[PDB]
């Protein structure tokens, strides 16, 4: 919790909590000014509750004072907090106006809204006057500048607490809230800035649970020497696919080359392996003789032998989801004695019994309803359900990478959300591969948690550099947009 | 990058 | 004073004095940042004395704490004053490194110094280890950061006092200091931030003396009304030269013109005033019958007749000093109904007996020399001697231009200091277009202050608009050169 | 009149008045289009009276009604002429608003004024509820558009009848009126539009008054053919000069040589004549001996000597103005047989009578000071007064330019107005230019009117050419950028 | 041009 | 320019 | 777009 490290900053490190809020303020003033240019010309509107929040924009309505053309200050709250108090005395001191009832038509004569009502830790549904003028200010087309998170989310889940701001700009303190990054909290955070208001460097590093970025993501990329040959790289068998679902083996085996595995095979019911050659005759589709389309038991003494030869084994997307499969992924994986990246029908399949029992790591993939399915919840009790995701890891012993707009990444210690993509991946063939890049990137050395971080990322980015209207995009293009996600990288 | 990630 | 206006802000306003120290430290980051760019390639070395000044060294050196490749403070005071001591607490729990003893090798290990050694209000020469490390810095080729003002200049003079810091960049808080307007200083400063700190900005506007800015001056040009006739915009004479001294009168002259005056005439000695049309034809050059080649009181009638149908007269530049000449400029003066600019020789014979008595305005452009001579003193006593001015421009009733590098122009109760220009402006000349400007703005209508501050500015700034090497700028080119200032300026 | 005009076009050609009306509003819809760009984002206020003004004011909110943000008329008339009140019942058809009385707070919700109060033939002073309407249109820093001509400007002399909108952009129907012309009204008028609307263009053609254009000055310049020599361009001489103005006859001759002109002569009294040659040394500067450095009867007949082999000769720029100069004067002009360009001081001296009894022609030059004393009446009865110019011009058998801002250029049959120039033509020196230039023409074969046409066109847009702020302008710089004038005109 | 002269 | 005059 | 859809 930053409430935490606020209180250690204060209590421990000496900081005045008055110098911390000072900070928080002037902050916001810069920022506005980096997104709007020079502030002289509009006219400011401040809507502070009476907690610190509101102690903050109290701040930012001082600050503004004699250099902007016109700032109010509407005070929604009933009290106010001592530092609340001090800053709002300031205020009215330096000569700034304060009015106690928020008239609609106020809207009228302002150009800027800042929005310092709630900040982080708000747990109760908004409701009454807070709500009217929340939906007000939603209404007016202004633009909206929200101190700390916008007023409304609720910090620690980003979800909406009945109604909350629609904030252009969000700027916050010391490090992004969950709040922030999780949707519907990130979609109504509008661009957000992360201010440094004087935290030791040291607490703001203590934080368990991170955004993934550009930077981490470039220092986990694997070094590429150049004495080096397929076999430095990696090989990744894939086991996917049915008669009924042809494709999907295609597009993670080419997802495992194009992070730069040295060698991908699938293992693919015939005559269906003959697909992914015929599109990319750098793979090995090796052809898989099954008595109805499906992988079943009889294709088991198989599919471990070609294991031995891989350093990681993919399962999962098309290969269909009947009994004599499930049989067939959970005899498998009890066996595999190597890395296995488990997807789709693999998880639909899955007992979690197998994954107690193996001492082999494992990484899997589910998207929301097929995480739903797997611990018997609803796709609401799981959706950007973090906690429930690293009890999972931890009491499974994987890496899950629970897929969505903001996809998290844990083994149960250590939590990472990725914010790259866009709404192109919303299609089939996105997740196929997804799975490919993990286990390549796992064959190649990084550990399941740092090929999970990087892969998600990478994914995510590839999307964004699509060329034309995002809807448009498709799996095989994201395949041809990898290793320029890579290159940007670096 | 002082004051501000972005 | 600013020492007043920190009181005033903390006493009176309740603003809490660290909040100030706060954010005159943090000032200091972002304006370091701005200039280097990214800071965390390089090794601050940051000198804190035990006054306010080293307690913004210690938030400064707090700040950099996590972020940079190294940060050292070495602590040269005896004691520290209240906010000095909790700031230095504070940069130790955040895990500083404070030293007491300086190294002269400790520079070796550091890029930049941070001079927070002693701030304004410093009145003593340095002397002793303080002087030593000072010296130590200026020898050392780093790049030097002074906090409030380089230490050992005299905020209030812009005097060294014993030996100061040469800075590259100093920040300074709600106002530039004298000590930084005026030389020595000037030069210590170095490039000059000054940061909004959180002043009231009706205090930081109470300030009675201003450098004088692009803004002012371009709210004070007057309006060029397009139904207009040469009368709209004034007429002056110009009562000039000798047969010594022939070139004064078609630089004054040109200057009113190249200002926007309406018409121009001069008053110089036959032959001398055929040298003005023939170098500008746009020029009335009036022929004065004289004995021996210098204007004496046989001229007087006639100069007082072409002087009905004018505004404003200015006098001096290239007159010649004899007994003759001193007689003539008096009482012309004492009779003289109409604002008089007096400049040059017109200075050196005036009897200020006869300034206090006139009824109308006059404006006196002396450099120091002329200055020392007027009031009986040295060079040196007069020299940047901006309460001198003042007393003797309220004494005598008149605006005092005090040309220098930095030009002082005060009426007694308001004084601005001029900082355009270069060492172009040193050479025979260049005075004598100022007079010739200074008499043109008041003949269009802007008041003496007001036509001296617009004038001085201007005169400065086109000097920095000659294309090729400043020391190469000749009076002539000035000319040529005034114009595109003026453009500029709007 | 355009009064008259569309009387002939309704009553003679049988065009109905509803179509003029029409054509006349959408014009001004098509003008207003031009300058904002695309109108459906903005919120018009429409101001009508009750005559024909107001008719084509709801023309205008008719056809801006569903296409923009919002319309509403404010109706300011007591009663409505015919067409008026069709089109006022078209637009209440259509479903427009209006409204009958102003409320100071209504132009709050609009971003465009439409000035459709008066039109032309405004004969009385505005007071009451109109001024006060006008006066908040004028303080309310919205865009304002002016039907026909700045409601409170009378369309036949420019003058402001009490108060007057300041208009940003004003369309005007067939030709520019005089009040658009002249100023003030010039000034209110802001950028002119002249919309077709649907006149015979033989009566548009049949107007008696004209402003300048590029056009007209482009056709009239002289041709050059290749085989010439300095005769082909004629010979001036300028009479000139006196030992207190010695700079006139330089500018007058140099003003000559710009334009085209063979060969100039100057006759000035020496030494004075010396300052000519220094500057410029193509020029001819005749040394004339004078008692006391003025032109007398005894310089008589070498002036007339020196006449007999120029073909024009411009008297005047800086003789002076004493009984010999006057002798000298109009003894010279009533023998010489030459076309003569008489100004400055050769008007102020000059005898009417000597006018009128010349057989060769003449252009005289005035600015209002010097027509005001030359007819005997008052600087506000002779400035801008075209109709005085006129009979003067018509009387004396003359040309006469009267110079202002707005230069009236007439031989008492044709008048034409010149709008070329801005403030920096507001000095000495400029005049005696122009001189130079009627002089020159004329010598090249224009007619005194072609010549005066030419000149005052060129001169003007020389001063429009200086790279620098106008005020900066000076006579000299104003001849080196009369061929560049010339250059682009062609 | 046929509209307006500017 | 809320922070800096140049 | 006042006078012309194209
Ligand atoms: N450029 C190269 N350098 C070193 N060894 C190589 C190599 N190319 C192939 N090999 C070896 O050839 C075998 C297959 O290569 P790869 O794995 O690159 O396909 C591996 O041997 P082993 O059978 O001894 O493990 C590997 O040692
Ligand atoms: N290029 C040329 N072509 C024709 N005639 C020229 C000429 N240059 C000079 N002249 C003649 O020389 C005389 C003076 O020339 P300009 O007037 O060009 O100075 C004039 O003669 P007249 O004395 O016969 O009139 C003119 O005819
Ligand atoms: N464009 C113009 N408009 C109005 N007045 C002008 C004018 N040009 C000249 N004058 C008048 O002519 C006289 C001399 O002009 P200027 O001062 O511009 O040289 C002044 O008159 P007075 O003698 O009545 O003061 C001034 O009124
Ligand atoms: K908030
Ligand atoms: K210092
Ligand atoms: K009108």
Request: aromatic fraction near 6%; hydrophobic fraction near 40%.
């Given at each position: 919790?930053?409430?935490?490290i606020?209180?250690?900053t204060?209590?421990e490190?000496?900081?005045?909590?008055?110098?911390?809020?000072?900070?928080?303020?002037?902050?916001?003033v810069?920022?506005?000014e980096?997104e709007?240019?020079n502030?002289?010309?509009?006219?400011?509107?401040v809507?502070?509750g009476?907690?610190?929040?509101?102690?903050?924009?109290?701040?930012?309505?001082?600050?503004?004072?004699?250099?902007?053309?016109?700032?109010?200050?509407?005070?929604?709250?009933?009290?106010?907090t001592?530092?609340?108090?001090?800053?709002?005395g300031?205020?009215?001191?330096?000569?700034?106006?304060?009015?106690?009832?928020?008239?609609?038509?106020?809207?009228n004569?302002?150009?800027v809204?800042?929005?310092?009502i709630?900040?982080?830790?708000?747990?109760?549904?908004?409701?009454?006057?807070?709500?009217?003028?929340?939906?007000?200010?939603?209404?007016?087309?202004k633009?909206?500048?929200?101190v700390?998170?916008?007023?409304?989310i609720?910090?620690?889940?980003?979800?909406?607490?009945?109604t909350?701001?629609?904030?252009?700009?969000?700027?916050?303190?010391?490090?992004?809230k969950?709040?922030?990054?999780?949707?519907?909290?990130?979609?109504?955070?509008?661009?957000?800035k992360?201010?440094?208001i004087?935290?030791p460097?040291?607490?703001?590093?203590?934080?368990?649970?991170?955004?993934?970025?550009?930077?981490?993501?470039?220092?986990?990329?694997?070094?590429?020497?150049?004495?080096?040959?397929?076999?430095?790289?990696?090989?990744?068998?894939?086991?996917?696919?049915s008669?009924?679902?042809?494709?999907?083996?295609?597009?993670s085996?080419?997802?495992?080359?194009?992070?730069?595995?040295?060698?991908?095979?699938?293992?693919?019911?015939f005559?269906?392996?003959?697909?992914?050659?015929?599109?990319?005759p750098?793979?090995?589709?090796?052809?898989?003789?099954?008595?109805k389309?499906?992988?079943?038991?009889?294709?088991?003494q198989?599919?471990?032998?070609?294991?031995?030869?891989?350093?990681?084994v993919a399962?999962?997307?098309?290969?269909?989801?009947?009994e004599?499969?499930?049989?067939?992924?959970?005899?498998f994986?009890?066996?595999?004695?190597?890395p296995?990246?488990?997807?789709?029908?693999?998880?639909?399949?899955?007992?979690?019994?197998?994954?107690?029992?193996?001492?082999?790591?494992?990484?899997?993939?589910?998207?929301?309803?097929?995480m739903?399915?797997?611990?018997?919840?609803?796709?609401?009790?799981?959706?950007?359900?973090?906690?429930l995701?690293?009890?999972?890891?931890?009491?499974?012993?994987?890496?899950?990478?629970?897929?969505?707009?903001?996809?998290?990444?844990?083994?149960?210690?250590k939590?990472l959300?990725?914010?790259?993509?866009?709404?192109?991946?919303?299609?089939?063939?996105?997740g196929?591969?997804?799975?490919?890049?993990?286990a390549?990137?796992i064959?190649?050395?990084?550990?399941?948690?740092?090929?999970?971080?990087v892969?998600?990322?990478?994914?995510?980015?590839?999307?964004?550099?699509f060329?034309?209207?995002?809807?448009?995009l498709?799996?095989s293009?994201?395949?041809?947009?990898?290793?320029?996600?890579?290159?940007?990288?670096? | 990058?002082?004051?501000?990630?972005?």
């Amino acid at each position: 919790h930053m409430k935490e490290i606020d209180e250690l900053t204060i209590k421990e490190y000496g900081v005045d909590s008055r110098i911390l809020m000072e900070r928080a303020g002037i902050s916001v003033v810069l920022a506005m000014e980096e997104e709007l240019g020079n502030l002289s010309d509009y006219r400011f509107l401040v809507l502070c509750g009476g907690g610190n929040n509101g102690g903050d924009g109290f701040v930012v309505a001082r600050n503004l004072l004699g250099v902007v053309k016109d700032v109010l200050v509407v005070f929604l709250g009933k009290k106010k907090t001592p530092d609340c108090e001090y800053n709002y005395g300031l205020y009215k001191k330096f000569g700034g106006k304060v009015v106690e009832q928020f008239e609609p038509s106020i809207l009228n004569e302002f150009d800027v809204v800042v929005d310092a009502i709630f900040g982080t830790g708000l747990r109760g549904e908004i409701t009454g006057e807070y709500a009217e003028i929340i939906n007000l200010v939603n209404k007016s087309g202004k633009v909206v500048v929200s101190v700390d998170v916008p007023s409304g989310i609720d910090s620690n889940t980003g979800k909406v607490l009945r109604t909350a701001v629609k904030a252009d700009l969000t700027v916050t303190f010391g490090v992004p809230k969950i709040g922030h990054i999780l949707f519907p909290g990130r979609d109504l955070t509008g661009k957000l800035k992360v201010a440094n208001i004087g935290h030791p460097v040291h607490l703001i590093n203590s934080i368990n649970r991170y955004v993934i970025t550009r930077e981490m993501v470039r220092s986990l990329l694997p070094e590429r020497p150049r004495d080096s040959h397929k076999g430095t790289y990696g090989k990744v068998l894939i086991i996917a696919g049915s008669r009924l679902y042809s494709g999907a083996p295609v597009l993670s085996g080419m997802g495992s080359l194009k992070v730069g595995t040295g060698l991908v095979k699938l293992a693919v019911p015939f005559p269906q392996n003959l697909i992914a050659t015929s599109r990319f005759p750098e793979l090995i589709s090796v052809p898989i003789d099954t008595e109805k389309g499906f992988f079943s038991l009889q294709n088991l003494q198989e599919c471990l032998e070609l294991s031995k030869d891989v350093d990681v084994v993919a399962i999962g997307p098309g290969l269909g989801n009947n009994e004599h499969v499930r049989e067939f992924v959970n005899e498998f994986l009890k066996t595999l004695e190597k890395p296995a990246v488990i997807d789709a029908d693999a998880i639909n399949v899955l007992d979690t019994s197998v994954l107690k029992e193996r001492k082999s790591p494992a990484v899997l993939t589910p998207h929301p309803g097929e995480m739903a399915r797997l611990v018997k919840k609803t796709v609401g009790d799981v959706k950007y359900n973090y906690e429930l995701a690293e009890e999972f890891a931890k009491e499974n012993d994987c890496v899950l990478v629970l897929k969505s707009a903001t996809t998290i990444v844990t083994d149960g210690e250590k939590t990472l959300f990725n914010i790259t993509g866009n709404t192109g991946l919303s299609k089939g063939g996105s997740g196929d591969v997804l799975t490919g890049m993990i286990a390549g990137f796992i064959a190649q050395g990084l550990s399941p948690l740092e090929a999970s971080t990087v892969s998600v990322y990478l994914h995510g980015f590839a999307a964004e550099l699509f060329e034309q209207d995002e809807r448009g995009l498709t799996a095989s293009e994201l395949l041809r947009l990898i290793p320029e996600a890579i290159r940007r990288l670096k | 990058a002082w004051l501000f990630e972005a």
